[PDB]
Structure formats: C-alpha cells, structure tokens
Design a protein around this nucleic acid. Structure first.
Ligand SMILES: [K+]
Ligand SMILES: [K+]
Ligand SMILES: [K+]
Ligand SMILES: [K+]
Ligand SMILES: [K+]
Ligand SMILES: [K+]
Ligand SMILES: [K+]
Ligand SMILES: [K+]
Ligand SMILES: [K+]
Ligand SMILES: [K+]
Ligand SMILES: [K+]
Ligand SMILES: [K+]
Ligand SMILES: [K+]
Ligand SMILES: [K+]
Ligand SMILES: [K+]
Ligand SMILES: [K+]
Ligand SMILES: [K+]
Ligand SMILES: [K+]
Ligand SMILES: [K+]
Ligand SMILES: [K+]
Ligand SMILES: [K+]
Ligand SMILES: [K+]
Ligand SMILES: [K+]
Ligand SMILES: [K+]
Ligand SMILES: [K+]
Ligand SMILES: [K+]
Ligand SMILES: [K+]
Ligand SMILES: [K+]
Ligand SMILES: [K+]
Ligand SMILES: [K+]
Ligand SMILES: [K+]
Ligand SMILES: [K+]
Ligand SMILES: [K+]
Ligand SMILES: [K+]
Ligand SMILES: [K+]
Ligand SMILES: [K+]
Ligand SMILES: [K+]
Ligand SMILES: [K+]
Ligand SMILES: [K+]
Ligand SMILES: [K+]
Ligand SMILES: [K+]
Ligand SMILES: [K+]
Ligand SMILES: [K+]
Ligand SMILES: [K+]
Ligand SMILES: [K+]
Ligand SMILES: [K+]
Ligand SMILES: [K+]
Ligand SMILES: [K+]
Ligand SMILES: [K+]
Ligand SMILES: [K+]
Ligand SMILES: [K+]
Ligand SMILES: [K+]
Ligand SMILES: [K+]
Ligand SMILES: [K+]
Ligand SMILES: [K+]
Ligand SMILES: [K+]
Ligand SMILES: [K+]
Ligand SMILES: [K+]
Ligand SMILES: [K+]
Ligand SMILES: [K+]
Ligand SMILES: [K+]
Ligand SMILES: [K+]
Ligand SMILES: [K+]
Ligand SMILES: [K+]
Ligand SMILES: [K+]
Ligand SMILES: [K+]
Ligand SMILES: [K+]
Ligand SMILES: [K+]
Ligand SMILES: [K+]
Ligand SMILES: [K+]
Ligand SMILES: [K+]
Ligand SMILES: [K+]
Ligand SMILES: [K+]
Ligand SMILES: [K+]
Ligand SMILES: [K+]
Ligand SMILES: [K+]
Ligand SMILES: [K+]
Ligand SMILES: [K+]
Ligand SMILES: [K+]
Ligand SMILES: [K+]
Ligand SMILES: [K+]
Ligand SMILES: [K+]
Ligand SMILES: [K+]
Ligand SMILES: [Mg+2]
Ligand SMILES: [Mg+2]
Ligand SMILES: [Mg+2]
Ligand SMILES: [Mg+2]
Ligand SMILES: [Mg+2]
Ligand SMILES: [Mg+2]
Ligand SMILES: [Mg+2]
Ligand SMILES: [Mg+2]
Ligand SMILES: [Mg+2]
Ligand SMILES: [Mg+2]
Ligand SMILES: [Mg+2]
Ligand SMILES: [Mg+2]
Lengths: 97, 218, 199, 55, 126, 24
RNA sequence: GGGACGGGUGAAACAGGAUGAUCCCGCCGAGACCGCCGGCCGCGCAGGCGCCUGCCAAGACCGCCUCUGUCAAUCAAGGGCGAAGGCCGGGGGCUAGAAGGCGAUCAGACACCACCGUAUUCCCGGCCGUAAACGGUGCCGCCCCGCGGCCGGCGCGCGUCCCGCCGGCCGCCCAGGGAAACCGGGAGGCUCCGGGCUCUGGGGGGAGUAUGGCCGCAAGGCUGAAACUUGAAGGCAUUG
C-alpha cells in the first residue's frame, strides 16, 4: 500500500472537515467532497410519447416541463453501476468530462 | 354498495373579476339529506388555478404562475372564490439554479390596510457582466447586504399599504417584479428577481364586503 | 408553616370606605418589599401584576390562575410552578393554557392570573439526609409519617398481610370499582413496570 | 383481434443468446421483438399494438 | 371542456392512477396496478399500469369527464425522486383512451431539510 | 485476528484478572 | 370523498385493511434538520464551521514618512482546549437505531436482507482525554528553472479590462534528491556530511502483558519490564 493519488481520493483543500451526504442508491454515509456527483435534466414524459401528449393538449403554446435532479453516489455504487470506470495508471490522470 | 353518483349534483366555481376566464369549472357534491347541506359542505374549498388558464393567450408570461382561490360564499348556486395565495411552478423554480452564481432568499410579513396579513417570499440570482475574465459570478458581502436591504425597502414602498384587490392586480401583472429588478439592477448584474410565493397568514372571519368588491366588478 | 413557597403581605386602599385593606399573595420570584403592584383590566405587563388572562400575550408565564372567573385563584400555586398562555380564541371568548402537568385546558378569558412564576424553586433538589429531616417536614404538615408496609402486617390489619414469606400473593393492580377496604395497591393501572421511551 | 402490421427495417438481435430481432413495424413507427427469421417487406400479425419494445 | 385532475403515483412497488375534481376534496376514479396482477413484482410495471388505466377510462367517462390536468409524483420524502416505470405508461393509456390533456406537473414531496433516512451509516450491504 | 478484536479480548481478560485479584 | 387490497424484496414471508386501509384534500401537534446554490470557495489553535433578525466582544491580511526599542526562538514541570462513542445529575422525545424480538436464506445462520423496537441521537451543569485526532511529513529563519488557477487587500496603466506587489490556498514541472513509489512552496541546497530548539526508534515475538506508581465515579488513561522463544519479519518494485 503506497499512495495511489495525489488528492488521496477526494477534493479537500485547506480545511479539516466537510459535510455528509447519503448515497442515493444504497444510503451509505459519504463525505461531500468525495461523493460522485452528476446533474441530469430530463422531461417527465418519454419523448416517444411527448408528441402524443403535445398533439392531445388543449393549451395553445404549451411546453413540456423539464426536471432538474442532482444524483450523488458512493464509490462502490458508482463503479458497480458504471458511472465511473477503473482506469489505467496513465489514464487516471485525465480530468476530461 | 349502491353507486354514490346517483345522488350527486354539481355547482359552478367563479373567479375574481381581475381575470378574463372566470368560469373555473364545475365541482360535485352529495345532495342535501340528513344534516349536511350541500351549500354548507362545498364552502371553503380551495382551488388551484393557472394564471395562463385565467388570462389565456399570454402563455409565455403567465403559464408558470399559479393562484389559489378559495370559495367563501355560495349564492344563487354559484361559488365565489377569493384570493388565497400565490406560487410559481416547480419546473420554473428548478430551472432557476446554476452553479457559479449566488442565490439570495428573503421574506417578510406585510400587512394590508383591510385586515389581511401576508408572508411574501423573494428570490434573486447574481449574474455575469458581459466583459469579465472569470466564470463564477460570486460577489462580496458588502454587495450582498446592499441587495438584501434593497429588497426589504423596495417591497416596503410598494406593498406597505395595499388592499387585496390592488394586490391581486399587481400580482397578476408582475408590477412589483419590474421594480424589484429596477432597484436591484443598480447594484450589480442580476438575472431573475421575482416574487415566488405569497402566503395568507391570518385573515378576518367576515369577508362579505371584500368578496362583494372582488367579484362585483365595482 | 407547612408551605414551601413564601407569601407576600400587600396593602391596598379601602375602595368603599376609609383606611387600608390587607391581602396575602403567593409571591412571584423577584417581588420585593416596597414594590408597587397593580390589579385591573388595564394593569401593565410586569412581574407581580394581576391581569385577565385574555389581556395577556401568548408565550407568557403566569401563576395562581383561576379556572372560573372571580374564584380568586387555584392553579400553579406550588413553589417553582407556572402556567403558559397558549392561544386566544375571541369568538368563543376562551383562552388555552398549559398546566404544570403538561395537560392543556380551556378557561374563560376574564379569568385572572398573576405575571411570573412562583418563588422557592429548586426545593426538591436537595436530598433529605436523615429520618429527622423528614420528621420535621411532616411535623409541619400532617400525621402521615413514618409509613408501615402492608406486607409487614398481619392479615387482620391489611389485605397484603400474612404468609410465611412476605409477599402480596395476588396481582396488586385493583379495578376502578373496588369498594373501600379493597382499593389498595395500584388503582386502575393502564400499565406497570419501569421502561423507557415515553414522550 | 388480429392487428396485421408491416416491418420496414431490422434493428438487430435482441436476446442474450441471439434469438429475437427488433423490427420497425407500421401511420406508426412501433418497434417490436420478433422470434424467427424476418426480412424487409414481411408481415407480422399482432395481437395488440398497445406496447412498443423496450429500448 | 370538462376538467378533472389525475394524480399519478409512480412508486417503487405499486402504481396509482386517481382522478379527483379541481379541489381534491372529491374523488371520481381510483385504480391501482396491484388490482390487475398475480405476482407482486409486476404491480409497478407498465402492463399493469396501462391495464388499470383502461378501467379508469371507463369509470371517468361514464361519470362525465373529458379532460384532465396531470399531477405525477415519486415516493419522495427522504427516499427516491425518479418515477416508477409505469407513470409514462399511465400517461400513454390516458391519451389513447380518449382523454384530453391540460396542465402538466411533477408533484413529488421534497424536503427543505430532513430527518435521517433508514439503512445506517454503512448502507444496505448486499 | 483483527487487531481491534484482539484488543477487545485483552481488555476482557484484564478485567477478569482484576476481578479475580479483588477477592482477597 | 371513494370502495379492495396495501406494504416489502433479487424473489418472498411477518406486521396493516369493510373497527373502510393504501390513495386525494383541508386542519391541528411535537422535535430534529438547514436542500438545489455548495466549489482544486472561504474561516479557525486544532477538534471543527451553512435558516431569519438583533446584540456582543474578537481575528489574520493589506495600506501607512505613526508609537516603542530587542521587549525574541523553542520548550522538561505546569495550565487550557479537544470528533464520535461512554459516564453522573436535570429536561425532552419526531427520525434513525447498539441490545432485545421476529420473517426469510441456509447444511447451520445465533450474520448479511425485511419488519418492530430500548439505551443513544437533541438541550442545560459536569466528567472522561482517546481516533487512519493523516499531509501517516514537528516549530522558527535563509536560497531556490519555470508555466498556470482560484481567494483577500493595494498601486500603475490605457479605454470593464491590463500589468505588477504583499499574503493565502491549489495543479504541472527543469535541476537536484531517493531503495523505489514519488518529492519538488521540499522529501532540494548532505559521505563535498556542522543555522537554532524539542520529541521518538534501534531484527521478529512474548507485550503494551506482569508488577509498582499517579489520574478517573466507572469504562480507562499515562508510565511500563523480565524470563523464554525465533531466521527471519518488513519496504518499494518485475514477470506469471
Ligand atoms: K506495504
Ligand atoms: K479518501
Ligand atoms: K481550496
Ligand atoms: K476548503
Ligand atoms: K469545506
Ligand atoms: K463528482
Ligand atoms: K464506497
Ligand atoms: K464584509
Ligand atoms: K455572512
Ligand atoms: K406518626
Ligand atoms: K416502610
Ligand atoms: K401476604
Ligand atoms: K396483487
Ligand atoms: K424529513
Ligand atoms: K425504522
Ligand atoms: K443496513
Ligand atoms: K449500516
Ligand atoms: K443498519
Ligand atoms: K440510518
Ligand atoms: K454502523
Ligand atoms: K463506520
Ligand atoms: K465501513
Ligand atoms: K460502521
Ligand atoms: K491498531
Ligand atoms: K486495532
Ligand atoms: K479499539
Ligand atoms: K454560499
Ligand atoms: K464562494
Ligand atoms: K459562498
Ligand atoms: K466562508
Ligand atoms: K465563502
Ligand atoms: K473569499
Ligand atoms: K463558503
Ligand atoms: K519566549
Ligand atoms: K523556558
Ligand atoms: K511550544
Ligand atoms: K508539555
Ligand atoms: K504537560
Ligand atoms: K478540556
Ligand atoms: K472537550
Ligand atoms: K470526545
Ligand atoms: K452517552
Ligand atoms: K426520540
Ligand atoms: K451505542
Ligand atoms: K454470526
Ligand atoms: K458473517
Ligand atoms: K422500525
Ligand atoms: K449510551
Ligand atoms: K433519550
Ligand atoms: K448515537
Ligand atoms: K435527538
Ligand atoms: K468526551
Ligand atoms: K496516540
Ligand atoms: K497510530
Ligand atoms: K487522511
Ligand atoms: K515539536
Ligand atoms: K480574486
Ligand atoms: K485577488
Ligand atoms: K480570503
Ligand atoms: K479580491
Ligand atoms: K483583489
Ligand atoms: K491577487
Ligand atoms: K508574493
Ligand atoms: K506570498
Ligand atoms: K493570510
Ligand atoms: K500546489
Ligand atoms: K502554500
Ligand atoms: K531557537
Ligand atoms: K516538542
Ligand atoms: K515523538
Ligand atoms: K512519538
Ligand atoms: K514513539
Ligand atoms: K531517541
Ligand atoms: K499491577
Ligand atoms: K477513583
Ligand atoms: K458509572
Ligand atoms: K475501579
Ligand atoms: K479500575
Ligand atoms: K516485505
Ligand atoms: K510493515
Ligand atoms: K506488512
Ligand atoms: K524498484
Ligand atoms: K523489491
Ligand atoms: Mg409480624
Ligand atoms: Mg382480609
Ligand atoms: Mg425511514
Ligand atoms: Mg431529525
Ligand atoms: Mg483543561
Ligand atoms: Mg422508527
Ligand atoms: Mg421506532
Ligand atoms: Mg452518547
Ligand atoms: Mg494521530
Ligand atoms: Mg484556491
Ligand atoms: Mg498500578
Ligand atoms: Mg525492486
């Protein structure tokens, strides 16, 4: 067990303690600067029915409401569900989204 | 179990004269037998009505605002609703937040000049100047304090002494939103400043004069 | 004598003649000799004043509260106790209060109270060390001490008496409609035992 | 009630072991799972058109 | 022209499609995915949701409704916030059962801050 | 053993020895 | 209001429901908590720190042709603070939940998974003094190729920008260092060895144990051997 990351597996810079967030999949306690975070924006009806809803509406000019949800997972759940992948030693240094 | 709708009968629901679609809809009730009078059970119902469904045609400007209208007197077999609260929609609220800007929330309890007391909730967001280096829009406390003070004193000028019908005029019009924005544009760039909710905290028991004024065009 | 909280002797003018009129009050904590107190529908909000509970704002500590108007005060009288004013309902003309047990109660709004809480608080936090301290305390009150246990008696003296070992013999939960002479032990108990987790 | 519809394209093998074939059947573009060999311009007799194939 | 409200509860384990009047105090229709199935794993499924919406159409149409405003929700509270699978299925069978659509909205119960969700510090260990 | 649980074991043993010596 | 199942799981079964549940809507009560915004942002001696309004005393930094005159650095003994759990005395009691109970799974399952639940979780007055209390990196001072980012204060410039200065937080990296991984604001300027001060180690076990002492209500903490036994244990790295 040498050290694997310069950041020790988290983003904690110049403090002692950071808040706790529950994982959404399994409900484990994870510190906020370690939890895997994503933001999704999606309609509330599938687009395969958004056309039928939009034809069968009555309001002239009506628009489909969106959704804004921030997903937060622990490392185990993220790897298991493939939000993040185990990478090569070279590839680990890439921060591109 | 016999079918309960063999004993049903509906009533009309009516919206204040501040609006152009005053037939909100029909409402059902069980006929009078025993001690429940139908017109002594359908009173005090609360209805939830979209502003674009009350002033139709301006969907872009009105569809994200919702009103609460409570029936408060039945006469002639008509129900007559009265101002009960204002809110914005959930997807409009969710669309407000980004990462990089600052969010300011305030509220205050505003009395009216006819016996009503309200809680009014305001939201504001910091914005990006057109020619600036950085991506974040965070601002300092010397500016945060100026914006909060501005919101307080502004809402104090406009809503300090109003009645319910004039309030409803302004709330349907966004008359207040423009001057919150006016007062707070002079301090920083800010993107969307608005009243998002109004909550009727305590009203008087007898509203017969008020509702006479609200429905009677007057 | 026999009372934990102190009393206050307070003088008013004779309102139907000449001279003065002497009253005894359960003393709120903070009252002091030479203080001026006020009693009426227009008295101010100060410790020691007597006001109708209708005129007293929600959140207030009161003591010596009447449960019906004019009866001169019967609630929250022991040392360290108080009642809270909870809410006002004008149309029925009733006020809601919290009693020291935590029960809620409606009283009239013209029932009067005294602002503050009863002095002498903390008294029960000192252990009695000796049989002698209990002796003096009860000598000031009543012939109720010391106490002999029922199981220590013969069966002629008590329904817990007798036996070759001291023991009650049947359950000591007795019903609500038991007759005098039978109604000993635990009277009409919803439950028993010592377990945590109430609220 | 039989609801005959016509395929206008093959999307690919669906089952983990090969098997079934996603097709674009028809004034509609319903997508459905099919067990046997199907070309273009072929016909499926549908017990119902209420559901469309997952994915 | 004749308007009612359709609450669609797309839970993790069951589905509700329920029609009331515009106030909510008076109900006109109530079906559930679990009144059309044998196996307990199929109630939150799209076939059960549609098959219950086909009975709801009959009830509401025969009592005299033609258009609905939709209020669609998840479990909420401290738990999940994505819908169950059959919510869009209920929307689909509702359009293809004749009904006209009005205002649309998500209606999940979300907290401003919260009490502590179950499962412990280490989570559901599976 | 995991050293955590070896530690819990040793503490129980020391507690037992101390109870034992307390007699006499 | 309405009328048949609801809950729960990978799948189920124990709890619930015609004493009308689950579902919809209005009203009331209580105690926690402070979302999105929320960050290679920020503050504090560390532990830590996020609702609104008011009050109260502080703090480092910058700017300065203000005051003083070595008043400093590090520190046995000694004093103060110190996550979570735990203890004593009062209060409170929504959520979750050690223990206890119960449905499954299984060869068994006293475990993982489902359900119910006591201490505990919250407040006030104390006590205890430990954590992978971590950057596994003691404090003061000097020199140090470069390229960026963010945070606070200041100054010159053109017409918000732009160039600099001080202080902080971070990324990458020449040289040099090293057993290497890596460091590089040091882990560099060191077999070409010497700026100042304090603490700790000396193969693996037995053992943080026995014994004595001090502290603590207890749970403990702090200090801490010997006989005897063993040829290795261990670091970083390569191929399978
Ligand atoms: K190692
Ligand atoms: K970590
Ligand atoms: K930082
Ligand atoms: K930080
Ligand atoms: K932080
Ligand atoms: K992340
Ligand atoms: K994990
Ligand atoms: K400031
Ligand atoms: K602040
Ligand atoms: K006696
Ligand atoms: K006795
Ligand atoms: K006996
Ligand atoms: K079922
Ligand atoms: K909650
Ligand atoms: K629970
Ligand atoms: K668990
Ligand atoms: K756990
Ligand atoms: K658990
Ligand atoms: K939990
Ligand atoms: K745990
Ligand atoms: K843990
Ligand atoms: K763990
Ligand atoms: K744990
Ligand atoms: K250890
Ligand atoms: K250990
Ligand atoms: K331990
Ligand atoms: K912030
Ligand atoms: K910031
Ligand atoms: K901030
Ligand atoms: K800060
Ligand atoms: K900050
Ligand atoms: K800052
Ligand atoms: K901050
Ligand atoms: K010194
Ligand atoms: K010294
Ligand atoms: K020191
Ligand atoms: K020391
Ligand atoms: K010391
Ligand atoms: K301390
Ligand atoms: K402490
Ligand atoms: K502690
Ligand atoms: K404890
Ligand atoms: K509790
Ligand atoms: K515990
Ligand atoms: K076990
Ligand atoms: K096990
Ligand atoms: K439980
Ligand atoms: K405990
Ligand atoms: K407790
Ligand atoms: K705890
Ligand atoms: K608590
Ligand atoms: K402690
Ligand atoms: K230590
Ligand atoms: K250690
Ligand atoms: K660490
Ligand atoms: K040191
Ligand atoms: K800056
Ligand atoms: K700056
Ligand atoms: K700063
Ligand atoms: K700055
Ligand atoms: K600056
Ligand atoms: K700067
Ligand atoms: K500098
Ligand atoms: K600097
Ligand atoms: K600084
Ligand atoms: K750095
Ligand atoms: K630094
Ligand atoms: K020195
Ligand atoms: K030292
Ligand atoms: K040391
Ligand atoms: K040491
Ligand atoms: K050491
Ligand atoms: K040494
Ligand atoms: K010893
Ligand atoms: K002791
Ligand atoms: K103890
Ligand atoms: K002891
Ligand atoms: K001991
Ligand atoms: K090794
Ligand atoms: K080692
Ligand atoms: K090792
Ligand atoms: K090597
Ligand atoms: K090696
Ligand atoms: Mg005898
Ligand atoms: Mg007898
Ligand atoms: Mg829970
Ligand atoms: Mg809580
Ligand atoms: Mg101390
Ligand atoms: Mg619970
Ligand atoms: Mg419980
Ligand atoms: Mg505890
Ligand atoms: Mg440490
Ligand atoms: Mg930074
Ligand atoms: Mg000793
Ligand atoms: Mg090697």
């Amino acid at each position: 067990m040498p050290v694997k990351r310069r950041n020790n597996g988290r983003s904690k810079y110049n403090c002692g303690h950071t808040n706790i967030v529950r994982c959404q999949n399994c409900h484990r306690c994870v510190p906020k600067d370690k939890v895997i975070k994503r933001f999704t924006i999606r309609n509330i009806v599938d687009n395969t029915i958004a056309d039928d809803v939009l034809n069968a509406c009555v309001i002239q000019g009506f628009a489909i409401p969106k959704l804004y949800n921030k997903v937060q997972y622990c490392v185990s759940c993220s790897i298991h569900n493939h939000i993040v992948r185990v990478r090569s030693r070279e590839d680990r240094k890439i921060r591109t989204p | 179990n016999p079918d309960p709708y063999l004993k049903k009968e509906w009533y009309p629901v009516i919206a204040p004269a501040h609006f152009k679609s005053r037939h909100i809809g029909q409402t059902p009730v069980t006929k009078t037998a025993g001690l429940r009078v139908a017109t002594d059970v359908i009173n005090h119902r609360v209805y939830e009505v979209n502003l674009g469904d009350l002033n139709p045609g301006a969907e872009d400007l009105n569809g994200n605002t919702k009103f609460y209208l409570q029936t408060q007197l039945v006469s002639d077999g008509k129900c007559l609703t009265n101002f009960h609260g204002m809110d914005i929609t959930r997807h409009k609220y969710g669309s407000l937040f980004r990462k990089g800007c600052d969010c300011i929330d305030v509220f205050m309890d505003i009395p009216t000049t006819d016996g009503y007391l309200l809680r009014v909730f305001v939201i504001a967001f910091t914005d990006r100047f057109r020619f600036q280096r950085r991506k974040n829009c965070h601002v300092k406390g010397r500016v945060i304090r100026m914006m909060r003070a501005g919101i307080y004193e502004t809402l104090h000028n406009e809503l300090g002494k109003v009645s319910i019908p004039v309030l409803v005029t302004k709330l349907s019009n966004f008359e207040v939103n423009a001057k919150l924005t006016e007062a707070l544009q002079k301090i920083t760039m800010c993107r969307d400043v608005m009243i998002r909710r109004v909550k009727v905290v305590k009203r008087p028991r007898n509203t017969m004069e008020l509702l006479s004024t609200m429905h009677d065009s007057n | 004598r026999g009372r934990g909280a102190p009393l206050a002797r307070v003088q008013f003018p004779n309102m139907r003649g000449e001279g003065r009129v002497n009253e005894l009050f359960i003393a709120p904590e903070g009252m002091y000799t030479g203080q001026e107190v006020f009693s009426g529908n227009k008295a101010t909000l100060h410790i020691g004043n007597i006001l109708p509970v209708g005129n007293i704002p929600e959140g207030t500590y009161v003591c010596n509260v009447e449960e019906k108007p004019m009866d001169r005060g019967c609630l929250a009288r022991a040392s360290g106790t108080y009642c809270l004013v909870v809410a006002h309902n004008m149309e029925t003309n009733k006020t809601r209060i919290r009693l020291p047990s935590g029960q809620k109660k409606l009283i009239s709004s013209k029932a009067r109270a005294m602002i503050g809480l009863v002095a002498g608080g903390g008294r029960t936090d000192k252990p009695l060390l000796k049989a002698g301290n209990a002796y003096h305390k009860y000598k000031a009150k009543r012939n109720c001490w010391p106490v002999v246990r029922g199981v220590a008696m013969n069966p002629v003296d008590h329904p817990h008496g007798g036996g070759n070992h001291q023991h009650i013999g049947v359950s000591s939960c007795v019903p609500r409609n038991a007759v005098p002479g039978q109604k000993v032990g635990l009277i009409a108990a919803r439950r028993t035992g010592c377990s945590g987790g109430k609220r | 009630e039989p609801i005959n519809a016509r395929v206008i394209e093959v999307l690919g093998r669906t089952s983990s072991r090969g098997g079934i074939t996603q097709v674009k059947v028809e004034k509609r573009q319903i997508i459905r799972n099919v067990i046997g060999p199907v070309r273009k311009d072929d016909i499926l007799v549908l017990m119902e058109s209420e559901r469309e194939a997952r994915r | 022209e004749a308007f009612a409200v359709c609450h669609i509860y797309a839970g993790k384990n069951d589905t509700f499609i329920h029609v009331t009047d515009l106030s909510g105090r008076e109900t006109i229709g109530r079906v559930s995915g679990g009144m059309k199935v044998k196996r307990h794993c199929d109630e939150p499924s799209a076939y059960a949701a549609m098959q219950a919406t086909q009975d709801l159409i009959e009830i509401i149409t025969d009592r005299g409704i033609t258009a609905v405003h939709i209020k669609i929700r998840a479990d909420g509270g401290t738990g999940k916030r994505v819908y169950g699978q059959g919510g869009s299925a209920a929307i689909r069978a509702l359009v293809r059962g004749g009904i006209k659509i009005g205002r649309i909205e998500d209606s999940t119960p979300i907290p401003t801050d919260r009490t502590r969700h179950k499962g412990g510090r280490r989570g559901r260990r599976l | 053993m995991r050293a955590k649980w070896a530690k819990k074991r040793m503490r129980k043993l020391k507690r037992k020895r101390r109870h034992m010596k307390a007699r006499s």
